[PDB]
Design brief:
Chains A, B: This is FACT complex subunit POB3. Chains A, B: It is found in: Nucleus; Chromosome. Chains A, B: Belongs to the SSRP1 family. It is classed as transcription regulator. The structure is a homodimer. Chain A is mainly β. Chain A has a single domain (about 1-113), classed as Pleckstrin-homology domain (PH domain)/Phosphotyrosine-binding domain (PTB) (PH-domain like, Roll). Helices cover about 15% and strands about 40% of the residues of chain A. The first copy, chain A, has an 8-stranded mixed sheet with strand order 4-3-2-1-7-6-5-8. The structure holds chloride ion (2 copies). One chloride ion binds near residues 3, 4, 24 and 25 of chain A.
Chain lengths: ~110, ~110
């Protein structure tokens, strides 16, 4: 749809359901994405995190693939995982441009050597 | 050994190896614990995080069991996982007494309701 940057099959805080993660100028969103089409998917409500609540963001190792661990002003650290190594460049650019946040690279133990 | 509070089979940042996690007055430690006895275990060096680097700590959902996500002054967010629900009370008490840190309970979505 062309405004937000979207990623499918992402998990929020080790959720059993996967969902779609969206990066918008307004902040972040995540919504359960499943089967049943317009029954089950239509009742679902999004998790919405306003950009004002973002403080730091790191790209690190998830349970599934790579993750973002996102520290917030009022809601602790939120985890999104299920990313591919391929996703990093896009994520880095989006967080810089939309939020002026530099994503920290902390996904292996040789970082900073 | 009676000074530190120790937990076995804990993983650091989704490490392939598990190790022993130790909570001491001086800060946190983690060291790979494996087989071979005094060959492989003896060469291993610990990860050491001085108490001065601790800022916030939350108890949340790991890849394995429950986790701590620990925000540090200079090293981003560190994850320890592999904890049982049983571990929480001890952890809460140790972080309060040793560091004056209140562990945030953020391990399910009904927290704060
Ligand atoms: Cl947008
Ligand atoms: Cl001690």
């Amino acid at each position: 749809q062309g405004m937000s940057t979207d990623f499918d099959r992402i998990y929020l805080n080790q959720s059993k359901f996967s969902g779609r993660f969206r990066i918008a100028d307004s902040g972040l969103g995540w919504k359960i994405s499943t089967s049943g089409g317009s029954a089950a998917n239509q009742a679902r409500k999004p998790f919405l995190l306003p950009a004002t609540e973002l403080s730091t963001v790191q790209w690190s190792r998830g349970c599934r693939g790579y993750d973002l661990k996102i520290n917030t002003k009022n809601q602790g650290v939120i985890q999104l995982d299920g990313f591919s190594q391929d996703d990093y460049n896009l994520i880095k650019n989006d967080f810089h441009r939309r939020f002026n946040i530099q994503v920290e690279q902390r996904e292996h133990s040789l970082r900073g050597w």
